[PDB]
Amino acid sequence: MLAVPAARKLARELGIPIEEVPGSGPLGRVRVEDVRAYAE
């Protein structure tokens, strides 16, 4: 799993396991948007 720091930071503050957030790049890079997208 590859998640930029901003996303890992936000995932925690939301109580969301980062490894559970689906990415978006050509191959899974998790962005802040994705973490929020999963949050909703």
């Binding site: 930029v4 720091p5 901003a6 962005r31």
Partner: protein, 460 residues
């Protein structure tokens, strides 16, 4: 008529990159060079200029060095410095020759004229190829009232510091070239005045960091006149009496210098090439028109670097050369990258991305973070810190938009900013990256933190 897969006109940064990348892709390549291998950058631009700056900086730092017990009575031999500068150029230009040969590229010496889309003439002989890449570079832009001559130098002549340092120098142009050469001359002992027509030097870059560079240059005795233009001059017994006036016009002042350096720009070398008759479209200023694929108006003919479009930077020409070659080789490449710009003065200046103004005009909700070098432990261990890092971003998406730096090693620190932009990093990503301490690079991290009002080494 010898034929090839590709013919490249010019072996400058853009040219030898296109030629070598093309070779790596399996194409039979012919490279034509009318002058010195390596182009402007290696011969009369980047390289010799950076070399002179390093020597000047080594000499200059000895003053501050006295502060930590380093006593010395430095004596710089200009003839020797010129020799070294030449030795450096010879190594690098010779290296390119070796490099071209090692990739199976054919190097042809001589001026090339474009006979047609797939044909070119050199020294009488004709040569053909399915693809042509135009990389002819640029040359010093002349200034009205200050024609180049014995007392009016272009950057090339200004590089030969061994042929006579003038007591007083007037530098026209507040861009990278003018600032760098002006500082070299000042540090070598000449009095230097630099004028710039726009409100601030480095008109295209961030005004705040550019102002810090100007004030730093003035502390060294370099007289920087912004919003000023040189109208004309008259040679007299005691020197060149130059008339200056405010940019918008007005009461002028007169100064006397021994030599004038004109560095107000560059002119693309696209004349007498046949581009006209060959259907290759050139714009108002002589730049070859091209799309993101570096393709001209004529299928199979590409243009790159300084001859193709601004900014006139070496790394930009190098990348365009790669893009051009790759498309000639049949791939599908396009130029869509952040291009940084650096000024190798001391302190150095570097920028990449959007300025606050460009960002706002772009519709982003602009927010900025600043960190001064005076708060950098590393900067202090280096003898003193004057400078700052400014990050520009969108406060709603937290997306980084631009980074501007003034201080030692700015040119080295901007690459991280460039990578950041390419990777779509947010200010938080930049702030959360653990930078090594103590390093100048920490200023970028702290600037990102200042953006969120939580910098640690300065009060927010």
């Amino acid at each position: 008529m010898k034929t090839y897969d590709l013919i490249v006109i010019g072996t400058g940064p853009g040219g030898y990159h296109a030629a070598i990348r093309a070779a790596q892709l399996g194409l039979k390549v012919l490279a034509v060079e009318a002058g010195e291998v390596g182009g402007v950058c290696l011969n009369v631009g980047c390289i010799p200029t950076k070399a002179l700056l390093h020597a000047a900086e080594t000499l200059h730092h000895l003053k501050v060095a006295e502060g930590f017990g380093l006593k010395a009575k430095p004596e710089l031999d200009l003839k020797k410095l010129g020799g070294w500068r030449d030795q450096v150029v010879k190594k690098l230009t010779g290296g390119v020759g070796t490099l071209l040969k090692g990739n199976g590229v054919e190097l042809l010496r001589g001026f090339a004229r474009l006979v047609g889309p797939k044909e070119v003439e050199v020294g009488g002989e004709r040569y053909g190829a399915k693809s042509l890449i135009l990389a002819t570079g640029s040359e010093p832009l002349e200034l009205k009232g200050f024609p180049f001559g014995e007392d009016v130098w272009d950057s090339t002549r200004a590089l030969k510091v061994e042929e006579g340092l003038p007591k007083r120098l007037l530098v026209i142009g507040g861009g990278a070239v003018g600032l760098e050469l002006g500082q070299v001359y000042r540090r070598l002992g000449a009095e230097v005045t630099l004028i710039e027509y726009m409100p601030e030097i480095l008109p295209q870059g961030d005004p705040e960091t550019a102002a810090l560079l100007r004030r730093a240059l003035e502390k060294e005795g370099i007289r920087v006149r912004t919003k000023t233009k040189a109208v004309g001059y008259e040679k007299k017994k005691d020197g060149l009496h130059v008339r200056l006036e405010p940019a918008e016009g007005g009461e002028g002042e007169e100064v006397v210098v021994d030599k004038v350096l004109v560095a107000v720009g560059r002119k693309p070398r696209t004349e007498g090439l046949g581009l006209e008759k060959a259907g290759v479209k050139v714009d108002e200023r002589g730049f070859i028109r091209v799309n993101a694929r570096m393709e001209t108006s004529v299928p199979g003919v590409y243009a790159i670097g300084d001859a193709a479009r601004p900014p006139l930077l070496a790394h930009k020409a190098m990348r365009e050369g790669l893009i051009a070659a790759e498309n000639a080789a049949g791939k599908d490449s396009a130029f869509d990258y952040q291009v940084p710009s650096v000024v190798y003065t001391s302190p150095e200046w570097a920028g990449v991305g959007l300025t606050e103004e460009e960002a706002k005009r772009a519709g982003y909700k602009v927010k900025v973070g600043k960190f001064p070098l005076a708060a950098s432990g590393r900067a202090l261990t280096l003898g003193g810190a004057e400078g700052m890092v400014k990050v520009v971003g969108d406060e709603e998406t937290d997306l980084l938009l631009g980074v501007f730096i003034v201080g030692p090693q700015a040119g080295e620190l901007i690459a991280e900013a460039a990578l950041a932009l390419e990777m779509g990093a947010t200010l938080t990503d930049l702030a959360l990256t653990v930078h090594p301490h103590p390093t100048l690079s920490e200023s970028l991290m702290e600037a990102a933190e200042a953006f969120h009002k939580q910098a640690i080494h300065i009060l927010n």
